[PDB]
């Protein structure tokens, strides 16, 4: 029995998400102190995100960008940082290196987009912008989504300095020094990734699909906030608890 009716049952919390707060922001912070913003309980339009041509290293892994509007996700964890112009290959699952291992690590089962633009007018001063920062020397390989905000002095060879910088003692947090005379491998990249999760929580945040009023016991093709299937909707006596 083919479905003779397709119904849409997205929730109607019609207030929009603050992607303008996330994307159009003055101060994206550094890769050692990348900012997390929780996006929930709103309608999120990703068509203006994909249709904007300012991005050049988009590369959404696991979810295709055109078919992204019609599912509904549990949570958006908007991470945002500024890196060098050759380290977006480090911002990917599987790849290891300086930015990937010692600054920000993605999960191996990562599902999300790697949205970034190239900003040379904004984040480069003639002379060098010196508080955009990155960590080289660290005695711990980071598990994904970790915070290394500590400014402890690193000891390498034998004797611990423990509070001073000197022989075999390097400070971990060193500046980029972004100048506009640099090439495209040294230009600032403002990388803002959107980590999602499919099945861990209630599905909340998604696109502007217009909901359709429900119909009864004829076999229909339903869309209940991201799960698509064909079947018969019938009244039930199953005591669903509110979680």
């Amino acid at each position, epitope marked *: 029995v083919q479905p003779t009716e397709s119904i849409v049952r997205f929730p109607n919390i019609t207030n929009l998400c*603050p992607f*303008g*707060e996330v994307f*159009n*922001a*003055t*101060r994206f912070a550094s890769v050692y102190a990348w900012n997390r913003k929780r996006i929930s309980n709103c309608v999120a339009d990703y068509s203006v995100l994909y249709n904007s041509a300012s991005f050049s290293t988009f590369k959404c892994y696991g979810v295709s960008p055109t078919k992204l509007n019609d599912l509904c996700f549990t949570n958006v964890y908007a991470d945002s940082f500024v890196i060098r112009g050759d380290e977006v290959r480090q911002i990917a699952p599987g790849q290891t290196g300086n930015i990937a291992d010692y600054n920000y690590k993605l999960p191996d089962d990562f599902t999300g987009c790697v949205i970034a633009w190239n900003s040379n*007018n*904004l*984040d480069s*001063k*003639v*002379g060098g*912008n010196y508080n955009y920062l990155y960590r080289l020397f660290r005695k711990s390989n980071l598990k994904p989504f970790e915070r290394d905000i500590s400014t402890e002095i690193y000891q390498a060879g034998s004797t611990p300095c423990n509070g001073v910088k000197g022989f075999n003692c390097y400070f971990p947090l060193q500046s980029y020094g972004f100048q*506009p005379t640099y090439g495209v491998g040294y230009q600032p990249y403002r990388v803002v990734v959107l980590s999602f999760e499919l099945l861990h929580a209630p599905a909340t945040v998604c696109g502007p699909k217009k909901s359709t009023n429900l119909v009864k016991n004829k076999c229909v093709n339903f869309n209940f906030n991201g799960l698509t299937g064909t079947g018969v909707l019938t009244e039930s006596n199953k005591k669903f608890l509110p979680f």
Partner: antibody
Amino acid sequence: QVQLVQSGSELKKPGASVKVSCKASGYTFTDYGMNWVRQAPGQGLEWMGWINTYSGEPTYADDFRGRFVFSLDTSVSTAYLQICSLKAEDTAVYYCARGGNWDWYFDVWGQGTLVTVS
Amino acid sequence: DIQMTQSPSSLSASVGDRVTITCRASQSVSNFLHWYQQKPGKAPKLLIYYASQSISGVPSRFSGSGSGTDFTLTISSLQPEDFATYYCQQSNTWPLTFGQGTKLEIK
């Protein structure tokens, strides 16, 4: 002395194209950006855009995206705005601002070209 | 895009009193406000940057404070020669959006 000398009062037809000036002296022109603002007489400050002082790309605000062009000339410290195809709703005074890439607090200082349109 | 309203629009004040005026933003601007004046026929002058700190070289008859979206400044000693329309300036999200202005009036 740090000051931003601004051109005189313009008065033209709704459809002409003029070019006001913002000439600066005293500070490092390369270090800071070159913000701009308008004054409707029954309203307040309204921003249009910043200009990087090494290349001069004309990025604007989200409202005034159209016929408005900023043109910076390097090594002479001139920061020309060119307004083209003026309308009757552009009876505003256009101050000039020093607004950097990092700081974004103004200390705005301009004499104000009294652009009256009729 | 930050729809900033500020209240009250036109308020009266007296000599040597203490008045409190507020500037409110719709979205989160959590610690970024800059405060201006507008005398007629005069370019604006900055007082308070990043909503707590004051600029060097201003007469300190005032202070600014606040967190979240509820921001204010308080005149601790008012003088009649100011009568300036107070302007608030956000610096978090583009575009740089200003306020309408609280005009100070003497009786």
